[PDB]
Structure 1
Amino acid sequence: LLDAAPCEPESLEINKYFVVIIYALVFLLSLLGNSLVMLVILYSRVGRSVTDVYLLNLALADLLFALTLPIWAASKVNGWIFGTFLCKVVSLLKEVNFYSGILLLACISVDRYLAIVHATRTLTQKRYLVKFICLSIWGLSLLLALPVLLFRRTVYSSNVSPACYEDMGNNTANWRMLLRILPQSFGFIVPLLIMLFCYGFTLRTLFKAHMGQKHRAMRVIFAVVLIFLLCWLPYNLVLLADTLMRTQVIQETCERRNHIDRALDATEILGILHSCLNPLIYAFIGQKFRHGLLKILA
């Protein structure tokens, strides 16, 4: 009989209450950093370059994501008790801004590639399309977040608390697994490959250069790539593990389910730090922004 018994979900309030403080801390830090980046960029219109436009869009996306975080924290505390309307709205905002952030990082990568590698060539002139590239990225992000709005509701279980989950009919499991392809291809793989190509060739050109500031630029590029990987690779690895398990590729057991759930929680917490870390890596690591910020404070 024990050979065939239901898998009992496993929880731990010790982490439930700790996740609230983690989310609140990230909320505050992202709010402050993105607000400062926006203020510094928008205070003076002098010297508004392509990078400034990209950073302004990125700060907007990160600020919106952070602004949605607290509702997610309360949900983690007590489950989605807020209704279906807020489930759809908050999910749409969160996913739109997630896609926007990733694609803006890829755009910044391509911009730096064109500015450094093709500095002598005429292709660098094509990096003056920031406004329409950013608008297209926002549009694509809005397009890719439609399934979240269309197929989400508050699902009530019998052994678990209500969740802002999907409802796609009798085959919701398989459709959800397929819909997972979008966040893992337009959200991890394609941006990761674009960033790797662009920054690899950028590093190849810099290493052969004779500048005095090549070294700091190389360190900054390495930090950007490593932060992106640290933030997003673990979550997508855990997601792929779950997808493999659901399809019987990896044998399924209760303990493995518990492990994947814990991993998903931890990796979501880890990935939520991109909003906090973007302002430090892309905006305040350059002398222009720091000088501007010091100027404004007067």
Structure 2
Amino acid sequence: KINVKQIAARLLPPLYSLVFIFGFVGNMLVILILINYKRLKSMTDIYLLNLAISDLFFLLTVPFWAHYAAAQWDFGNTMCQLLTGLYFIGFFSGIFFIILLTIDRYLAVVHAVFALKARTVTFGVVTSVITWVVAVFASLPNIIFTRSQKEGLHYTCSSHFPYSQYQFWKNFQTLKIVILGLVLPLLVMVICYSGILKTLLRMKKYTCTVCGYIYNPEDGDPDNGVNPGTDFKDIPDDWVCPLCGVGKDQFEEVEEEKKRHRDVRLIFTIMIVYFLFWAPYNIVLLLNTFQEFFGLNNCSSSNRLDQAMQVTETLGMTHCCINPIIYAFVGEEFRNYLL
């Protein structure tokens, strides 16, 4: 193997220090705004706080990985298992809360009348604790294999799998991270945003550019054969404006009025940004462990893919300081609050 450790000792400590500062300040501001300004009045507000905590737990580990890159593992065994633990917990709960935010929006938008009954602060609180328990238990096998050890003269913090079962463990721990961190959020994204997009469209108002008439799907146009609850897009093209009598071509889409519909932009941005930072590691991890059989094992491609894993995971670690920026730009409340 090629020694990149001499290079990593120079590069990673300043990089990890910026990410820690920027990310700690950013996530802390989100937390004080949600508890003090916003005061946690919705189910959404509970999951946002918990997501902000998941980013923080993960962030606290970053100064330790920085020092370990710089020098060696000077924190000991418990610390090695704790920080590896917090890293995995912070990772799993983070994506679990991105999934819970998506499901919350699917309920508010798709099952609106039910959501009034189901979406409460206390149900959001109850589901958060369950999520944390699931995350800790998802991280637990990984914490077991992790330990501090003196290899000759230097102290290391790594996970070591039993030699007689090494391929099995690499195989299994890869599929836990890929199923939970890529596959599971992707099915949640496709299934949920299918329903959300279909509800958003079937409920879109359209205004006539000529007379100003507003077509509302809820009302329809029953005097002209258009039954209430009809997507304007589903109306036959032989239909004309009830006021000025012009065709569908002259109709323009009305900008979203419903706040619950407007909040979709934020929660979808969070998920898409998660995939930009973490889908690269997930694919390289799957390519490394498994695809060696289904691709290449060369001393070149083995060293290339292992370096690719080092890069793609540093990129993912960066994601912990990204959500505050999203809230500052896309987040409507946060925008007016700062204004």
Aligned partner (choices 47, 51, 57) of residue 58 of structure 1: 51
What does the per-residue CA deviation read over 1:134-188, in whole Å, with 9 as the maximum and x for residues that have no partner? Answer: 1111110011111122121135557998342224353234223212221111222
Equivalent residue letter for 1:288: E
SS in 2 for 1:273: helix
Aligned partner (choices 91, 110, 119) of residue 127 of structure 1: 119
Aligned equivalent of 2:255:
212
Alignment partner of 1:35 is 2:81: no
What does the per-residue CA deviation read over 1:101-120, in whole Å, with 9 as the maximum and x for residues that have no partner? Answer: 0000000000011111222x
Question: Which range moved further: 148-157 or 215-224?
Answer: 215-224
> Residues 259 and 45 (structure 1 numbering): CA distance in 2 closer, same or farther, change over 3 Å?
closer
Contact 1:27-1:69 within 8 A present in 2 as well: yes
Shift of 1:217: 5.7
> Residues 218 and 61 (structure 1 numbering): CA distance in 2 closer, same or farther, change over 3 Å?
closer
Contact 1:92-1:148 within 8 A present in 2 as well: yes
Contact 2:106-2:195 within 8 A present in 1 as well: yes
Aligned partner (choices 182, 188, 194) of residue 176 of structure 2: 182
Aligned equivalent of 1:5:
none
Aligned equivalent of 1:267:
312
Question: Which range moved further: 275-284 or 208-217?
Answer: 208-217
> Residues 47 and 146 (structure 1 numbering): CA distance in 2 closer, same or farther, change over 3 Å?
closer
SS in 1 for 2:297: coil
Shift of 1:92: 0.7
Distance in 2, matches of 1:69 and 1:257, equals 27
Aligned partner (choices 88, 92, 97) of residue 85 of structure 2: 92
Aligned equivalent of 1:4:
none
Shift of 1:268: 1.0
Aligned equivalent of 2:294:
249
Question: Which range moved further: 193-202 or 253-262?
Answer: 193-202
The normalised TM-score by structure 1 is 0.84
Distance in 2, matches of 1:216 and 1:82, equals 47
The normalised TM-score by structure 2 is 0.75
- Cα root mean square deviation, aligned: 2.7
Aligned equivalent of 1:166:
160
Aligned equivalent of 1:150:
144
Distance in 2, matches of 1:143 and 1:12, equals 32
Contact 2:181-2:282 within 8 A present in 1 as well: no
Identity of matched residues, %? 34
In the alignment, structure 2 segments of 5+ residues that lack a partner are 206-253
Distance in 1, matches of 2:166 and 2:148, equals 14
What does the per-residue CA deviation read over 1:44-89, in whole Å, with 9 as the maximum and x for residues that have no partner? Answer: 5756111111111111111111111110122223343432221111
Higher-Rg member (1/2): 2
Aligned equivalent of 1:74:
67
Aligned equivalent of 2:192:
198
Alignment partner of 1:232 is 2:278: yes
What does the per-residue CA deviation read over 1:222-277, in whole Å, with 9 as the maximum and x for residues that have no partner? Answer: 5334312211111010001111245x333312111211121111111111122111
Distance in 2, matches of 1:249 and 1:159, equals 38
Question: Which range moved further: 278-287 or 81-90?
Answer: 278-287
Whose relative contact order is higher, 1 or 2, with alpha carbons under 8 Å and at least 6 apart?
A: 1
